[PDB]
Amino acid sequence: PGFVGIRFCQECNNMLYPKEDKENRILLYACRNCDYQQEADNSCIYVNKITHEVDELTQIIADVSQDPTLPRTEDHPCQKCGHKEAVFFQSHSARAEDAMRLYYVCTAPHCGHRWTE
């Protein structure tokens, strides 16, 4: 599955509330301040991932390669740019940090490619 985002109203720019359609049996997000209706996209209006299957590559930014305080390795080349040097670090996050998973970020400028071993 996937996460669900908060829908926004078009007139008063508030957040839309899901509701059911009594005649067409479809789900509709409805504003409460004004009366604005829209055709919903997916049946999943709520989701809850509890098993912390949190991919970390999205949270890792390419700017971290500029940090002098991180360890460097000439042992793992970049997959995209082929740069032989890349830095590595832990997950750096709560709801995590139970497994020692290394995350690699290529230090080559203007590439910023990141991956996990």
**Residues within the annotated binding site for Zn(2+)?**
9, 12, 31, 34, 78, 81, 106, 111
Radius of gyration of the chain (CA): 22
Q: How far is the CB of 58 from other proteins (least distance, A)?
A: 8
> Is 60 among the residues that bind Zn ion (CB under 5 A)?
no
> Candidates 26-34, 44-52, 62-70, 90-98 — which segment interacts with Zn ion by CB under 5 A?
26-34
By a kind-dependent CB cut-off of 5 to 8 A, residue 50 interacts, out of other proteins, Zn ion, none, with other proteins
Answer left, alpha or beta for residue 71, where phi above 0 means left and psi between -120 and 50 means alpha: beta
Contact 60, 101 (CB under 8 A): no
Contact 111, 78 (CB under 8 A): yes
> Is 87 among the residues that bind Zn ion (CB under 5 A)?
no
